[PDB]
Design a protein around this ligand. Structure first.
Ligand SMILES: CCCCCCCCO[C@@H]1O[C@H](CO)[C@@H](O)[C@H](O)[C@H]1O
Ligand SMILES: CCCCCCCCO[C@@H]1O[C@H](CO)[C@@H](O)[C@H](O)[C@H]1O
Ligand SMILES: O[C@]1(c2ccc(Cl)cc2)c2ccccc2C2=NCCN21
Ligand code: NA
Ligand code: NA
Length: 504
């Protein structure tokens, strides 16, 4: 079995997985909308009661499975729980990262695409008033994706958008086809420092921004001034547990697969703790210091609330580019911003395709070359649904990327800590540990952690599921049809895997 070469590479690959577009866009907007500095109260709590416990569990499950030659959840769930229904539930840990990969690599390609257009100067140059600057960039983005100009839910990506998508797939395959240590690990050691340098340079330049409408301090102010009155709102605590769960990328099946390349007795308690921390530092220090302070510096604290309400996507793909076109050296600034996001995306997409590659390798005994190429093929082909059908992206992100991961997160806890056995699980987590998990966490993992996840799931099921089902366009059935098929197809592969094993 392949293994991580160095402890540092392992930590950087894992941190690379967690640190994504969300760190620099989603988190700052969530924080501004949910109590500013006060949001750190339920955020740290969520990190301690949900994020850290579950992450350790996923590392343990991954390492446990890897020792027996299995890096994915159909095989691993079966090992923790010998039942046919365990295998079926395990398919989700293969299906979720696959579906997310199907739209996420495309989004990732947008940033590479924007980075190049900025570098070579193929971007709008307004002219005045805020809308006079924002609109040409709104239009730039819309022409790239091919946002529908009519009533048809049809997208028309530019040739440039399409070729960059091809290039992006090529880069992913390039890394993945070289394997865990010589490919993913080697790349983490380059991308993670590069990421840090870009962010630090941006944080510095943002902190020097001064306009007639405000400064970076005004931005940092608005973001971090606490609003403790929002702590009463249940949705703020849900937001925190939600934010933590998603920032760490728990429930995607990715962490388990990566951990399966950790050796049987190699530490996971400290390594895991360090990786989660890197994500957090990247999130609150760097992520919170770039996008919101820059936006508020240019548009003024008066529009801060409006900016936060406009969302993470608009901030990163419309608002900030517009600001860069109005600032000195903003052309090279825009390149750095989108290059930064691209590496943030790239370190995450490789991790998210690895479970499929691992499954093809571990269970169907494919060579790495074939496993990577076929995985790329399924992802490349399927992505045409995301590129051409409007709102397809949102549908996949809801079922797989939102509802799915929380359900799968809860499923992992129960199978490992309740079915497999809390005591067997506890020893599994601490074995080889440079540090030992604090004894209090034995109760957290068994009762508190699943309780939190259950509450989150129910609130979200009650809140969002009725809306998506009753108020959406008929074309959503196209996306549902396709991803349900993917689940059927994966089930078949799991079926073929167990049959091959019975023969040999
Ligand atoms: C943290 C960054 C997350 C990236 C969010 C990507 C969501 C963009 O998604 C797309 O945006 C287009 C522009 O409005 C819309 O026309 C499409 O309906 C939508 O699918
Ligand atoms: C059924 C699979 C067909 C997938 C078609 C993908 C290629 C079509 O591509 C289309 O044509 C233009 C150039 O070709 C580009 O502007 C865009 O990529 C796209 O709109
Ligand atoms: O960027 C992701 C991610 C997860 C899986 C893949 Cl295949 C690609 C990207 C992501 C997407 C959507 C919601 C949450 C998350 C996430 N958490 C860490 C990495 N990561
Ligand atoms: Na993150
Ligand atoms: Na990443």
């Amino acid at each position: 079995r392949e293994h991580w070469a160095t402890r540092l590479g392992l930590i950087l690959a894992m941190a690379g997985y967690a640190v994504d577009l969300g760190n620099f866009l989603r988190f700052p907007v969530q924080a501004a909308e949910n109590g500013g500095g006060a949001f750190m109260i339920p955020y740290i709590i969520a990190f301690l009661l949900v994020g850290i416990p579950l992450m350790w569990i996923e590392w343990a499950m991954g390492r446990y499975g890897g020792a027996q030659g299995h890096g994915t959840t159909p095989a691993i769930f079966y090992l923790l729980w010998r039942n046919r229904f365990a295998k079926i539930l395990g398919v989700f840990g293969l299906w979720i990262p696959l579906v997310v990969a199907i739209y996420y690599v495309y989004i990732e390609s947008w940033t590479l695409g924007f980075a190049i257009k900025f570098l070579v100067g193929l971007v709008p140059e307004p002219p005045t008033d805020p809308d006079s600057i924002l609109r040409p960039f709104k239009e730039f983005l819309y022409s790239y994706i091919g946002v529908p100009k009519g009533d048809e839910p049809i997208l028309k990506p530019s040739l440039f958008a399409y070729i960059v998508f091809l290039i992006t797939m090529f880069i992913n395959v390039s890394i993945l086809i070289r394997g865990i240590s010589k490919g993913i690990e080697r790349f983490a050691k380059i991308a993670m420092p590069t990421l840090f340098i870009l962010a630090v340079f941006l944080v510095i330049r943002v902190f020097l921004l001064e306009t007639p409408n405000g400064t970076a301090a005004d931005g940092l102010n608005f973001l971090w001034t606490p609003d403790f009155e929002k702590l009463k709102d249940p949705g703020v605590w849900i937001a925190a547990v939600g934010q933590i769960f998603f920032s760490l990328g728990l429930g995607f099946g990715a962490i388990i697969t990566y951990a399966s390349y950790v050796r049987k007795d190699q530490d996971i308690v400290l390594s895991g703790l360090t990786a989660a921390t890197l994500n957090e530092k990247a999130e609150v220090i760097l992520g919170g210091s770039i996008s919101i302070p820059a936006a508020v510096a240019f548009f003024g604290v008066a529009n801060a609330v409006a900016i936060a309400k406009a969302g993470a996507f608009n901030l990163g793909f419309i608002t900030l580019p517009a600001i860069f076109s109005q600032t000195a050296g903003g052309t090279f600034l825009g390149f750095l911003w989108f290059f930064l996001l691209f590496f943030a995306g790239l370190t995450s997409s490789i991790a998210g395709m690895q479970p499929m590659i691992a499954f093809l390798e571990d269970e169907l005994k494919l060579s790495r070359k074939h496993a990577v190429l076929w995985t790329a093929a399924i992802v490349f082909f399927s992505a045409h649904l995301v590129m051409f059908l409007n709102k397809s992206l949102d549908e996949m992100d809801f079922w797989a990327g939102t509802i799915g991961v929380v359900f799968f997160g809860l499923t992992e806890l129960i199978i490992f800590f309740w079915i497999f056995g809390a005591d067997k699980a506890w020893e599994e987590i601490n074995r080889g540990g440079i540090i030992k998990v604090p004894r209090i966490y034995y109760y957290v993992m068994r009762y508190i952690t699943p309780a939190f996840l259950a509450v989150l799931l129910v609130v979200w099921a009650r809140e969002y599921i009725p809306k998506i089902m009753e108020e959406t366009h008929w074309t959503v059935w196209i996306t549902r049809f396709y991803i349900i098929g993917l689940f059927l197809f994966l089930t078949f592969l799991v079926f073929l895997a167990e049959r091959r094993r019975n023969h040999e």
